[PDB]
Amino acid sequence: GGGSMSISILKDKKLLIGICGSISSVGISSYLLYFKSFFKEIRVVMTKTAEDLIPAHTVSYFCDHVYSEHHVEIGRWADIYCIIPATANILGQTANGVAMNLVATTVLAHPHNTIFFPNMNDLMWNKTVVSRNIEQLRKDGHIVIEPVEIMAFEIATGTRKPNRGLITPDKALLAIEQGFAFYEILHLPNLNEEQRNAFIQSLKDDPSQSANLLAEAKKLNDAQA
Amino acid sequence: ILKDKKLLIGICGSISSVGISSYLLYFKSFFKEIRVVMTKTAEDLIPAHTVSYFCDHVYSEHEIGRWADIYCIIPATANILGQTANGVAMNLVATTVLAHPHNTIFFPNMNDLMWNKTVVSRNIEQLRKDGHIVIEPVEIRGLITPDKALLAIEQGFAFYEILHLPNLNEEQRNAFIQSLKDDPSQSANLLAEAKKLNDAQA
Amino acid sequence: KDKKLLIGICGSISSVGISSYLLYFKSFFKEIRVVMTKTAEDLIPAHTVSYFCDHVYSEHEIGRWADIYCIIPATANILGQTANGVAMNLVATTVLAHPHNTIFFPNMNDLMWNKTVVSRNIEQLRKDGHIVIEPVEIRGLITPDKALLAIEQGFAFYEILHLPNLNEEQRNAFIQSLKDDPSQSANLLAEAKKLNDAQA
Amino acid sequence: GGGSMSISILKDKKLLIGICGSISSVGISSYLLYFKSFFKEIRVVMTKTAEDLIPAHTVSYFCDHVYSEHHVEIGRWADIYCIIPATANILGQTANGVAMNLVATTVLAHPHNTIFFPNMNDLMWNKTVVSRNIEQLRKDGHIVIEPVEIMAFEIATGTRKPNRGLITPDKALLAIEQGFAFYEILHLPNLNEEQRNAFIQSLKDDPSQSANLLAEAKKLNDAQA
Ligand SMILES: Cc1cc2nc3c(=O)[nH]c(=O)nc-3n(C[C@H](O)[C@H](O)[C@H](O)COP(=O)(O)OP(=O)(O)OC[C@H]3O[C@@H](n4cnc5c(N)ncnc54)[C@H](O)[C@@H]3O)c2cc1C
Ligand SMILES: Cc1cc2nc3c(=O)[nH]c(=O)nc-3n(C[C@H](O)[C@H](O)[C@H](O)COP(=O)(O)OP(=O)(O)OC[C@H]3O[C@@H](n4cnc5c(N)ncnc54)[C@H](O)[C@@H]3O)c2cc1C
Ligand SMILES: Cc1cc2nc3c(=O)[nH]c(=O)nc-3n(C[C@H](O)[C@H](O)[C@H](O)COP(=O)(O)OP(=O)(O)OC[C@H]3O[C@@H](n4cnc5c(N)ncnc54)[C@H](O)[C@@H]3O)c2cc1C
Ligand SMILES: Cc1cc2nc3c(=O)[nH]c(=O)nc-3n(C[C@H](O)[C@H](O)[C@H](O)COP(=O)(O)OP(=O)(O)OC[C@H]3O[C@@H](n4cnc5c(N)ncnc54)[C@H](O)[C@@H]3O)c2cc1C
């Protein structure tokens, strides 16, 4: 199924997007504008390197507000906290509980969990620490959306090298929907392990079903209070 | 037939400048060398250091007309059209139009409202009467895609080159032009045939 | 006629008194915003002008926000820019970004006013659909009340001239009554719209 | 054997040296100048604290170029990336995949592995986290050259306390040669565990043999393709 199918569950949600210092951040509007018609309100928090690549005044044209590091309530303001693109550095900080910029701090100050969208060249992606930190973030309850292997321009080399890049805005929207349904189903009180793994396994096989799955998981929740 | 030429791209203060990389990278495999000159508003939207990752050099408002073999302004604002159409040159982008030998290819980009303003159409027609080329935008009204932009650049180069062949006559001149306005992907084959009829009639 | 009015201030000494106009316009329009050039800000700070209107746009959207865009006072430079399609400051740009036409209130000394290029730019602006209110010989601005009457008259001019499914008869009938009583603009235009939809 | 014996393998190599905020950085010229006659080209990337101790304009007198934090291609530019002197902080960042300055980022963006030269007083060296991070860097494939116990001036105390200091420029040059031969031999395709451990064990017993060892390990590589 498609991406614009579980729109229901994002209709009233506040989305906070953290932008890190990756060259793909220059194109973040393609994500922002696409998300704009699905959430109640979208705000952005940026690192300094992201601001050096693309100014906060530019990003503000594509969302409701931009938080710059020159704001500790934004983690509670957001219903969904998504970091895209996420650098190896933000993964290292968040996986190790270090919070030196507002994006990494928002991970700790945000109530539930964070959805990361890593983006780096294949060289950095194959470093041991990066994989270790990804797996630590996953074990701590955060969600790390896998990038796709493509041949993109390498800023460093001026030629096309192998790069681990972002999924399209619709596949990202599906990833956010799926992840939200993941956390909500995982933390429903009046359910047992078999029904919970039943709802989770069908989310990993068809994420466009998130709306229908979550909607049914809530009604089996109250029926079993 | 552009692998020999130096391409200079001037960026003006439009939000579409944030996507200029999509053009720069695409052009990179067709021209000998691509450099960029920016306005201050364009730099405020997207820094010159960011653009530099996608080209050979970026000239900021902090010679280049003669360096370029082809000068393309993309995106072009209404203001840059008003300046160039009236011979006013207050930033480096407009000045390069005056300092560049031959003609300039403009890629205007504006909302549908500004495009229908009388002064804007007047300035477009003035630029066209002065020998410059103004590429029409499409409805998606935005800029054409990088592949169509490349075809338009090629077509414009072939236009100016055929129009300024010395020992050729009006009928064959419009003959080479009319087949370019009907098939721009033939620019390589037509221009190559126009030069060999040139020396054959010396 | 509770439309939104945007006023552009150019670098003229008369800008120091722009409040006398703003306040007067404020007593007719419910919402008034101002956009300034840098020179106008050097003469009178934007924070000072902000005491007399709802918001001041500085050089440190608004064309579509405004229903009526009026440049007062307008310098020779702003006339040269707007007449030639050149937009180098926010005031001149708003002329291009505004959906309809602009009302200019030129203010300059008689020397600059009698220069050929200035008259040429005025006539070019008029030929392009913009309205240029004539100054008085003192060459200064008309009083605020007459300025408000001129703004109403100009707005109704453009609105009546562009009625789609209405004919030259009723259109010239609504126009001739505007040149004789501009304070009737609100009553005239309101009657022109209802004859509009009645003749769809 | 001596240090100027395996010069062959550095003749065509580009060396990037990262300087961290240690007082020994004030004397880095003794290393730079000594290395200058052995590599094709030597560039430097500095942290802010290193720049506070010794200005980048001063270091530029002793190498080909100085990268200051006020440059993501330098990791691919370098053939060999060496961090000297390395602070406890740079070890903490690199061991945990955190990249907040250009030196630590270059570790991730550099294609192979990094050779660290730690330098700190004996007090910091005996902290548990420092040893843990050293061992983590070693387990992740990086090389950490051991400092030597001496009695040096303590900036903090104005008297001589025990300090863990750098090896001489020639022993460092040997360490770089040895480490380069280590990685190259470790990643030769057409070799088996017994021949590889044979080449490695003789590198740990005589590093001045690196040139002869690597040269032979390549010719047994192609002979076994
Ligand atoms: C053009 C370019 C593209 C890049 N693309 C990628 C990529 O796709 N993937 C990838 O993994 N890496 C990439 N990097 C490297 C990455 O930017 C560095 O690792 C950087 O240090 C991490 O940036 P960040 O936005 O995650 O955090 P940053 O906020 O950038 O943290 C480091 C930077 O922030 C500033 N800073 C100062 N104090 C602090 C503080 N207390 N907390 C936080 N920041 C501080 C510093 O000036 C420093 O440059 C790129 C670098 C460049 C120059
Ligand atoms: C987000 C945004 C998007 C826009 N998109 C479009 C569009 O698609 N189409 C369109 O026609 N118009 C657009 N405009 C309006 C356009 O930017 C203005 O008309 C502007 O004056 C055009 O500038 P330019 O890039 O043509 O040349 P510029 O060189 O930008 O023209 C002069 C401008 O540059 C700055 N500048 C020049 N020299 C200096 C200096 N020495 N110091 C400081 N500042 C200096 C000034 O602030 C001035 O506004 C847009 C404006 C904005 C804010
Ligand atoms: C005391 C005083 C009295 C005046 N009286 C009159 C009058 O009676 N009538 C009249 O018509 N005018 C008057 N002017 C304005 C003056 O005559 C000029 O015409 C002035 O440049 C008008 O500009 P502006 O008001 O439109 O402001 P703006 O359009 O903002 O003027 C442009 C300003 O930006 C700066 N600038 C320079 N280069 C650039 C660039 N490339 N891009 C952007 N900005 C640039 C300049 O310093 C200049 O002041 C007066 C000015 C002063 C100081
Ligand atoms: C004179 C002196 C000598 C020292 N000698 C030693 C030694 O021999 N061994 C040892 O282990 N420690 C030493 N230290 C302590 C060490 O400098 C600190 O731990 C320091 O924070 C690490 O410096 P660095 O060069 O590794 O990284 P730094 O780049 O120095 O990181 C911290 C410093 O960088 C600046 N900074 C700001 N934002 C960022 C960012 N996003 N990323 C990186 N840096 C940022 C800060 O101003 C801060 O002071 C010494 C300190 C001093 C003052």
Author numbering:
A (entry chain D), D (entry chain D): -3 to 66, 75 to 229
B (entry chain C): 5 to 66, 77 to 154, 168 to 229
C (entry chain B): 7 to 66, 77 to 154, 168 to 229
Provide passages from the article that reported this PDB entry.
Here, we propose a method for generating proteins and protein complexes with complicated shapes using fusions of alpha helices. To design amino acid sequences that can stabilize the alpha helical structure of the fusion sites, we superimposed one or two turns of terminal alpha helices of connecting proteins using a molecular graphics program. Then, the amino acid residues important for forming a fused helical structure were chosen from the two natural sequences in the superimposed region. Our method does not require complicated computer calculations for the design process and can be used for the assembly of artificial protein complexes with predictable and rigid structures.
